[PDB]
Swiss-Prot record, chain A:
Substitution effect: residue 23 to A: Reduced growth at 30 degrees Celsius. Strongly reduced growth at 16 degrees Celsius
Other comments on record: Present with 468 molecules/cell in log phase SD medium.
From-to range in the entire protein, with total length: 1836 to 2069 of 2413
Protein name listed in UniProt: Pre-mRNA-splicing factor 8
Role: Functions as a scaffold that mediates the ordered assembly of spliceosomal proteins and snRNAs. Required for association of BRR2 with the spliceosomal U5 snRNP, and the subsequent assembly of the U4/U6-U5 tri-snRNP complex. Functions as a scaffold that positions spliceosomal U2, U5 and U6 snRNAs at splice sites on pre-mRNA substrates, so that splicing can occur. Interacts with both the 5' and the 3' splice site, as well as the branch region. Has a role in branch site-3' splice site selection. Associates with the branch site-3' splice 3'-exon region. Also has a role in cell cycle.
Organism, as annotated: Saccharomyces cerevisiae (strain ATCC 204508 / S288c)
Coiled coil: none
Gene: PRP8
From Swiss-Prot, chain B:
Protein name: A1 cistron-splicing factor AAR2
Phosphothreonine PTM sites in chain numbering: 257
Gene (name only): AAR2
Entry keyword annotation includes Hydrolase: no
Biological function: Component of the U5 snRNP complex that is required for spliceosome assembly and for pre-mRNA splicing. Involved in splicing pre-mRNA of the A1 cistron and other genes that are important for cell growth.
Family assignment from sequence similarity: Belongs to the AAR2 family.
Source organism of the structure: Saccharomyces cerevisiae (strain ATCC 204508 / S288c)
Main subcellular location: cytoplasm
Subunit structure: Heterodimer. Interacts with PRP8 (via RNase H homology domain and MPN domain), competing with BRR2 for the same binding site. Component of a U5 snRNP complex that contains at least the U5 snRNA, PRP8, SNU114, AAR2, SMB1, SMD1, SMD2, SMD3, SME1, SMX2 and SMX3, but is not a component of the U4/U6-U5 tri-snRNP complex.
Keyword Phosphoprotein attributed: yes
GO biological process: spliceosomal snRNP assembly; spliceosomal tri-snRNP complex assembly
A Gene Ontology term for the protein's cellular component: cytoplasm
Length: 237, 300
């Protein structure tokens, strides 16, 4: 069934599973026309498909050309997401295909289910968790590759860099979601925290800085503090 | 006009014939129903005074033979049977009339209700949903499950309704995933109408039979099947105009006939609100929409 706090450790067992987040598939700017009416301009987006156990990210870039001449784009974006995830499963060898796909938004269930009809043993599941994967475009290297794309394109990343050499998936996922939660609640502060110290660099093949273990502890504390402060501000607590 | 005699009435039971019904007391001298209109299917149904669970009954057509009811004290229920001795049968019917121990099918001449509820129902199709080919009549009851229900246990006792499933390969052409799921026209017209049912009239007949089974026996899988077949039409953008107009009449008389107190379990809120107000055919069911609003505005 649905995924929640109770059955959270299932993410880190050895059953292959993927999260799919469609929040950044259809992205627009809103602007005024000469005659004063409002219009949208699409920019490039991406499907965020992540194996939480291994860090493997399948970033499917959605080029604005997909939308040309189409109506009801927000609805279409859900079916294009499902189309692309299904194609991704088909492209993987059998022993790499997931046993479950967890969609971060319930509106994706019917489209994926319909697109996955060829895979009746792949379970499509919703989640009750409030996952922060929308903030994926706050990771500079991911936003950069999406905005530069001139055609549809799949880019692979490990979203955990090399963390699993030293920590477990559980902890890696907790760090990732903390980082993203912070970037989501106050991107400017979050990014300030990550880069304040110019002597800690990001490897060419990484997304995040090469913090030592001790420095990751200071970072994670700084992100937690940021998140709590923003809460009191939002609600006056 | 035809007759269905009863051997006796040993147990207190409410007897129904089509939309009419009568209370019969234990060992009351009751011996049949006469003046049954030839030309339509009919259903005789029962509910014992002691077990207000398990409504059950028999679908039949008097053209197909001479049928009668007899209580079986081993199995504990009124059984329909066929008399092959045509003479022996007219003998029993005439003497029970002479002794006036039979109720008359109480049809008002102005009233086309039963015609309207059974317009497309044909005994031959009923016998393919209720497979029991040694009898010419068909038993149905409250608890019988459908073939689709069984897939998600005893097949001899199944309702073999046509399986409809909106999230199946049948329903969805590869490459037209989004199209076919938002616009079921393909599934309705090519797969179901041209492919399985062959014509609109067989489709309507199963739809009507599923409704009558849900209404008369509270058969839950039948209710599911009636709603699915309505939803398949209302969720298709391209439907023959003759089907839409006829559907509006069919549903009207079904909603009209339903017991007011049963609207809660028999009427699926989601399906009706989607059909009447959200679907492609929202504007094609004026009579069904008008009676639903005036009689069950709560459900909507």
């Amino acid at each position: 069934g649905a995924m929640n706090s109770s059955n959270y450790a299932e993410l880190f067992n050895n059953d292959i599973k993927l999260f799919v987040d469609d929040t950044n598939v259809y992205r627009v700017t809103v602007h005024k026309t000469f005659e004063g009416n409002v219009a949208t301009k699409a920019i490039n987006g991406c499907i965020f498909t992540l194996n939480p156990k291994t860090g493997h990210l399948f970033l499917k870039i959605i080029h604005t050309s997909v939308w040309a001449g189409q109506k009801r784009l927000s609805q279409l974006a859900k079916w294009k997401t499902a189309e692309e995830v299904s194609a991704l499963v088909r492209s993987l060898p059998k022993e790499e295909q997931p046993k479950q796909i967890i969609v971060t938004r319930k509106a994706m269930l019917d489209p994926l289910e319909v697109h996955m009809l060829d895979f009746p043993n792949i379970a499509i599941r919703p989640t009750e968790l409030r996952l922060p994967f929308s903030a994926a475009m706050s990771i500079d290297k991911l936003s950069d590759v999406v905005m530069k794309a001139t055609e549809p394109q799949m880019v692979l990343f490990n979203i955990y860099d090399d963390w699993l050499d030293r920590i477990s998936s559980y902890t890696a996922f907790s760090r990732l979601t903390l980082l993203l939660r912070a970037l989501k609640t106050n991107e400017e502060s979050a990014k300030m925290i990550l880069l304040s110290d110019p002597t800690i660099t990001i490897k060419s093949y990484h997304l995040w800085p090469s913090f030592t273990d001790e420095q990751w502890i200071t970072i994670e504390s700084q992100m937690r503090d940021l998140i709590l402060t923003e809460y009191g501000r939002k609600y006056n607590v | 006009m035809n007759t269905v005699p009863f051997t006796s009435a040993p147990i207190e039971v409410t007897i129904g014939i089509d939309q009419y019904s009568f209370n019969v007391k234990e060992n009351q001298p009751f011996h049949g129903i006469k003046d049954i209109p030839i030309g339509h299917v009919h259903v005789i149904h029962f509910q014992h005074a002691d077990n207000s669970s398990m409504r059950y009954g028999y679908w039949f057509d008097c053209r197909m033979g001479n049928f009668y009811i007899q209580y079986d004290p081993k199995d504990g229920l009124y059984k329909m049977m066929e008399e092959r001795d045509g003479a022996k049968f007219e003998n029993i019917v005439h003497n029970f009339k002479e002794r006036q121990m039979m109720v008359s099918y109480p049809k008002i001449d102005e009233d086309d209700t039963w015609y309207n509820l059974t317009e497309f129902v044909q005994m031959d199709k009923i016998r393919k949903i209720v497979r029991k080919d040694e009898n010419q009549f068909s038993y149905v009851d409250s608890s019988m499950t459908t073939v689709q229900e069984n897939e998600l246990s005893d097949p001899a006792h199944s309702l073999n309704y046509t399986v409809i499933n909106f999230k199946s390969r049948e329903a969805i052409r590869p490459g037209h995933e989004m199209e076919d799921f938002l616009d079921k026209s393909y599934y309705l017209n090519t797969v179901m109408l041209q492919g399985i049912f062959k014509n609109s009239s067989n489709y309507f007949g199963e739809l009507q039979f599923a409704f009558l089974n849900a209404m008369f026996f509270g058969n839950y899988g039948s209710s599911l099947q009636w709603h699915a077949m309505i939803e398949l039409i209302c969720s298709s953008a391209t439907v023959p105009k003759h089907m839409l107009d006829k559907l509006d009449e069919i549903l009207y008389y079904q909603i009209k006939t339903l017991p007011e107190q049963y609207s809660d379990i028999l009427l699926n809120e989601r399906v009706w609100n989607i059909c009447l107000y959200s679907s492609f055919q929202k504007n094609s069911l004026h009579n069904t929409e008008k009676i639903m609003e005036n009689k069950y505005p709560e459900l909507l």
